[PDB]
Amino acid sequence: IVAAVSPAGGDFSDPVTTATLGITQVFWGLDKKLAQRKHFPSINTSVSYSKYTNVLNKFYDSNYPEFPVLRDRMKEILSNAEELEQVVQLVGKSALSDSDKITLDVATLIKEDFLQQNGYSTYDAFCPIWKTFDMMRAFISYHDEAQKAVANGANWSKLADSTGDVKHAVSSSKFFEPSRGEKEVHGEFEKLLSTMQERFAESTD
């Protein structure tokens, strides 16, 4: 059952929304402000839970996807982002370390590619579950490398210049279609994992 809700009582703790959130098992957010600004369907990561996740992810795990491990790290990046968001507003940008900048920066990539959904079905708005894992795999493979570089010495700015080409590709993931690489995932994504490694070795040195 996919059920839409909306307020109806002039309150944010309204009788329709409260009694339904109890009986529901998957809760995926959505914010009105983001949706107007162009990010529909929108999603709120701290105002969501899903009880079925544990079995379902394990199902995707056996078929090919490395899926469970990725899911926890995507939320994690976004959690730290909220904390960062308040410091960023107040003090500014001129005080955050190299690690913290990345957290925001990979967060941008997820916001761009998942939360926005270009068209009815144009711009390949249809992503299969296996493509989605590949879209995510590209960002978190980038996050771990990105976290290692700053830690092993490499300025946020330097690391951004040097990443260059592999970063544009992951940014461009949503226009691409999986039906011309295999049939459900892209040969282009497999090639992307090799390219990441190569880039990283040059850039660190």
């Binding site: 002039g10 309150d11 944010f12 308040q86 003090v91 005080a95």
Partner: protein
């Protein structure tokens, strides 16, 4: 004025925002103020240090000028048109703020002139020049803390304004708003019930009667 129903969720988060802001900026302030105190003490000492060493070398040069005959120092000033000790500036993040720092590099453009050699009188200027170079180089390195110190001086005033500004204007405005709309909001839920209940009593009475 303020919203009729449910500002409270928003105002809750406004209340939270305000309050986190005050804590963090007071920590940022706390680190700047703590570092500044230490730097203030270094500086008071250093000023005495620089003055004493600079003057000892000053007195040695002054005697030299008089003994050699004539005011040598006018001649030296014109003749000199390049500098050995320059600085290349670098940014250092201390206490979340970016400061300017200076790093000296000693260029070998000049090391001897045409006034440190004259014959016998020249040997005196030379002995003076050497005390001044050693004394001064130290003074340049100590001067580096000054530049940063002045930027710190500026930043503490701004940062202090902010902790006090969140405290006085924002937090109590947020208390006053949240209360007035909470009380209105509650009034709606209770009066609604009261009007409906009061009418029911009548409707019930009529049916019993007829």
């Amino acid at each position: 004025v303020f919203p009729t129903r449910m500002t409270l969720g928003l105002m809750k988060t406004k209340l939270k925002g305000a309050n986190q802001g005050y804590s963090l900026l007071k920590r940022k302030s706390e680190a700047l103020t703590k570092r500044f105190r230490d730097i203030t003490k270094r500086i008071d000492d250093a000023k005495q240090k620089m003055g004493r060493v600079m003057q000892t070398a000053a007195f040695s040069l002054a005697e030299v000028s008089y003994a050699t005959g004539e005011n040598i120092g006018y001649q030296v000033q014109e003749s000199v048109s390049t500098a050995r000790f320059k600085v290349r500036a670098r940014q250092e993040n201390v206490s979340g703020v970016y400061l300017s720092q200076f790093e000296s590099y000693i260029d070998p453009e000049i090391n001897d002139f045409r006034l440190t050699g004259l014959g016998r009188g020249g040997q005196q200027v030379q002995r003076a020049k050497e005390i001044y170079s050693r004394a001064v180089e130290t003074l340049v390195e100590l001067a580096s803390l000054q530049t940063a110190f002045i930027i710190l001086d500026e930043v503490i005033k701004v940062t202090n304004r902010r902790v006090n500004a969140i405290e006085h204007v924002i937090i109590p405005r947020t208390e006053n708003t949240i209360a007035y709309i909470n009380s209105e909001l509650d009034e709606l839920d209770r009066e609604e019930f009261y009007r409906l209940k009061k009418v029911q009593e009548k409707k019930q009475n009529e049916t019993a009667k007829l």
